């Protein structure tokens, strides 16, 4: 029952942000904005009012591009491959709505419901990939399956919203490449605590989660080979105006402030040491699961040493997590997320309570949670 | 050459916002956020970090609904008919992508390019409506035309981004209703200086303009008869999850902060007196056009007494406004918008410089502009 690695990171992180009113263990849903991030945003809006809205935006180009670059660095793409979105669903929809010719797709059974929804809405046939009892892709079986039965692209949610299994992203991406098939990665969850530098052809993620930037921002990155094959829904493909596929994908009103906010927030991840941060988040999972290994009416779902901060609890006596969550919030200020089946229809047989705490979490807090979980009605 | 009505409104408005670095005459592109609005936004983001992101959002429901209601009041819809968007293009796309059965449409020749683009992208046949030499719809001819040749809906940009003609919105809407045809109104420009209470079946607008709220927010309002006929692209119409058409349209990650920001900003319009504000904006146009009636190399396009703050200048010696604009900004701190043909392809034969100043503008400033316009190379 091993103890915690003391890191000045956990502490710097905590103090860089407003103090939690209660106890916040859902950076997986929406993390917490640093003062700098918050202020960077406010600043932009202030500046919009001074110099003019679109001149302010121009002025922010350095900062916007900063963020692209930072994002690019974490996924191994070019900054010029990275576009801004409203989030990871805007992202996957921009992508799939743009996707040329044949629209077959393989993905995990664990695939995110709203993703499947976008997949379906864009007319993709969607096969499952072989997995283990956890939902972790069997990379071998999948390679064989993908050669035998080819598919127009593979969509890998590298880290799932509903379960803290880290998918073997890089080895699936090579397997898929060996079969001559592109890989889209949903890194909404993964960007910030999984090595997202893995060879993917497109990646997307959201600002508000592990990168702890503003809501209303996400990113989509597409390798230029793929980017230029894409056919944006809007404008129509018979286009008088000459702009690139990515320029088309990034077209539309948006909170630029939030985007500069985001840029700060990514910068801050890089600043803290990507690799340093992921190791802590992995530890956070360990501690979280070791601390929660002993709770009646609640089973920990993920293997102890999954390198992840998402841990999920299945109720062993029919308790509904949705309720437990809103209890935990209203009574004890503890913020959690409650994952309904719709999050992963073809894998979740039963809902779960999701702890997703950041580096800042202490063993006290994990213990406060465990405690408060027991006292829960 | 009549003078200005002194109103404590102009002054209250100015002082409620950060002071303009130079001179800002493009509230038509992006206006200026009050301190309250800016702070309301920051606050939300701060609060996200304290209590949790989605609990903060819940908490803001009062404020969010406030804004719907306020918007609703200005267009004569129910607050429950109003949904939040990213802007007026998200809006028209959400609408047209959702539109059932036959997709014919009539609109002005003056129709906004990006609108036509969305129209086309959603497979609408798009007829023009009869207009005068200004582009103002001939309501009579149009009624006759719409009875003789029916169309699945009419799309009226009530106030055009490229020209400060106020379209006879209410009388066209009855004409269209007398022919049994619904009206969608693009009130991106109009919401805030035209009476948008006119009988339209859907209306949409943006936060960042005359309502001077945050970027990344717009609104879409749809009357329930129409709302429930609509078929959202995403999720697919074969939907396991039971949510209303509007709930579907409002689904997706977003800057909630910005939305509460917006709510403040609408509130502030109501607070100032809608009718009071529009009368000033109309005066602003008068003054703007009277002050600019005498400039060489620049003709005022709109009739003097169009009840509008948008005035546009056509260069009489081949000057490119794009350039003049970026000169005006870099040299004299005067912010303007330069309207390229793409803004209204089937009406604009030639680009224009657009003054769109708010209530705060003084005759000095309009004169400073006129002056600075002369000295421009
Ligand atoms: C993020 N989502 C959540 C609210 C959560 O609690 O998990 C998410 C997204 C959705 O992207 P948006 O930015 O549009 O919200 C994408 N896919 C995954 C795996 C996920 O974690
Ligand atoms: C607003 N647009 C401008 C940038 C301008 O300078 O006019 C606009 C919109 C576009 O909506 P978004 O909120 O997506 O930008 C819609 N239609 C009109 C008439 C217009 O003024």
Residue numbers in the entry:
A (entry chain A), B (entry chain A): -5 to 371
Text from the published report:
One of the key steps in the ergothioneine-biosynthesis pathway, the C-S bond cleavage reaction, uses the pyridoxal 5′-phosphate dependent C-S lyase to produce the final product L-ergothioneine. Here, we present the crystallographic structure of the ergothioneine-biosynthesis C-S lyase EgtE from Mycobacterium smegmatis (MsEgtE) represents the first published structure of ergothioneine-biosynthesis C-S lyases in bacteria and shows the effects of active site residues on the enzymatic reaction. EgtE and Egt2 are PLP-dependent C-S lyases in EGT biosynthesis, leading to the conversion from sulfoxide 4 to EGT. Each MsEgtE monomer has 15 α-helices and 11 β-strands and is classified into three domains based on the domain assignments of NcEgt2.
In addition, we also found the electron density of aminoacrylate geminal diamine intermediate 15 in the structure of MsEgtE(Y106F)-PLP-geminal diamine complex. The geminal diamine and PLP C4′ are both covalently linked to the ε-amino of Lys203. The captured structure confirms the presence of the intermediate 15, which is formed by transaldimination with Lys203 during the C-S cleavage reaction. This reaction ultimately results in the formation of pyruvate and ammonia, while simultaneously regenerating Lys203. The structure of MsEgtE further corroborates and complements the previously hypothesized catalytic mechanism of EgtE, and confirms the existence of aminoacrylate geminal diamine intermediate 15 during the catalytic process. Remarkably, phenylalanine substitution for Tyr106 results in a 6.5-fold decrease in kcat, while a 1.5-fold increase in catalytic efficiency (kcat/Km) compared with the wild type. This implies that Y106 plays a crucial role in substrate binding, and specifically, the phenolic hydroxyl group of Y106 contributes to the substrate catalysis.
